[PDB]
């Protein structure tokens, strides 16, 4: 699968039950360590285990090449393979991701692809999932359903009509972290090369849900997904899944206050 770097691990031996593909790129060093030493920290949640890796492409940059290459031998969990590392290859990263789970982790329960900019409550969203008893086809996040594309020309999401000939998108959810079954990676990367490419990751999954029958569903009756950003406090913290809008720093207080205050009741 021409992959540079693959993670030490055998979802043969032990499946996790959740596995974290994260987004960031070269650069981000700071947030991938500020993810390792807070939500990304693998461990047994309730029994199930909890693995997460990185998706990387590549950058002309050989300082930014050789520090990639020292990050990958010192943690082990980098996901590489050889595309120039831009904002418009995104959809090329997270077929990465998913072509991983596909050839090296079919067993993966559940799968979440992330942002490197976010609060993720894997001890939540874990006793979410055990309740949805919903094991195939199952897809979920901030569901996003009658979206138009975005003509702006200078905004960050802007497609031309050439890129996006439609009026309107197909569902998707937002790309800030969603959450599916491990069988839907095999069947995304079999019809993948069968749709119409779009440079937004998370509308090119939703195209290929759609072509796969594949309905989008809201993991709990309480919103849990805020790709808006949250005003913080850690009574709503424990009972949310994702938060997107969090730096590095952010992230590390918000953990810490999680931790100071774990073992007080909330209303
Ligand atoms: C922050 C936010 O919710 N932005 C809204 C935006 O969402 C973006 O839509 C893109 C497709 O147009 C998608 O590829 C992006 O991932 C997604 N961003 C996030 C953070 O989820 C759209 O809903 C537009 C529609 O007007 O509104 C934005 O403000
Ligand atoms: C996405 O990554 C691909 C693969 O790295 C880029 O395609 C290459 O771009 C370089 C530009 O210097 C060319 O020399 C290569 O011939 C291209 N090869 C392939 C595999 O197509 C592509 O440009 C990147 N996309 C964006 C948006 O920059
Ligand atoms: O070359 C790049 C640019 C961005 N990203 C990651 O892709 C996500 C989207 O980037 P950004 O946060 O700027 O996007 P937005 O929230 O505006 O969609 C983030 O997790 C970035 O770390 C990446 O992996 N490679
Ligand atoms: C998830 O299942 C829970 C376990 O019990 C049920 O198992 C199913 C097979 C059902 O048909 C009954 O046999 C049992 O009640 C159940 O308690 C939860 O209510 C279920 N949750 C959802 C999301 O429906
Ligand atoms: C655009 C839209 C979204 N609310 C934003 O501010 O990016
Ligand atoms: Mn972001």
Redesign the pocket.
């Known amino acids: 699968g021409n992959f540079l770097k693959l993670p030490d691990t055998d979802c043969r031996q032990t499946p996790p039950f959740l596995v974290l593909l994260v987004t960031s790129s070269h650069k981000q060093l700071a947030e991938r360590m500020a993810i390792r030493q807070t939500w990304g920290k693998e461990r047994m949640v309730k029994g199930k285990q909890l693995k997460t890796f990185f998706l990387l492409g590549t950058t002309s940059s050989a300082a930014e090449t050789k520090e990639v290459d020292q990050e990958s031998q010192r943690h082990g969990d980098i996901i590489q393979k050889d595309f120039l590392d831009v904002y418009y290859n995104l959809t090329l990263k997270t077929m990465m991701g998913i072509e991983w789970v596909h050839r090296f982790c079919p067993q993966a329960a559940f799968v979440m692809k992330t942002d490197s900019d976010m609060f993720i409550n894997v001890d939540y969203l874990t006793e979410l999932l055990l309740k949805k008893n919903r094991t195939t086809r199952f897809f979920t996040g901030?569901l996003?359903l009658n979206?138009?594309?975005?003509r702006q020309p200078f905004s960050k999401?802007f497609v031309s009509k050439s890129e996006y000939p439609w009026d309107r998108?197909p569902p998707f959810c937002?790309?800030?972290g969603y959450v599916f079954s491990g069988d839907v990676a095999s069947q995304v990367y079999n019809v993948s090369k069968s749709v119409p490419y779009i440079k937004?990751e998370?509308?090119f999954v939703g195209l290929c849900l759609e072509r796969l029958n594949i309905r989008l569903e809201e993991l709990h009756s309480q919103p849990t997904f805020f790709?808006?950003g949250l005003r913080f406090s850690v009574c709503l913290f424990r009972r949310i899944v994702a938060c997107?809008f969090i730096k590095p720093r952010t992230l590390l207080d918000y953990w810490q206050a999680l931790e100071n205050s774990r073992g007080e009741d909330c209303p």
């Open positions: 901030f996003k979206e138009f594309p975005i999401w998108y937002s790309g800030t937004l998370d509308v790709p808006g997107h």
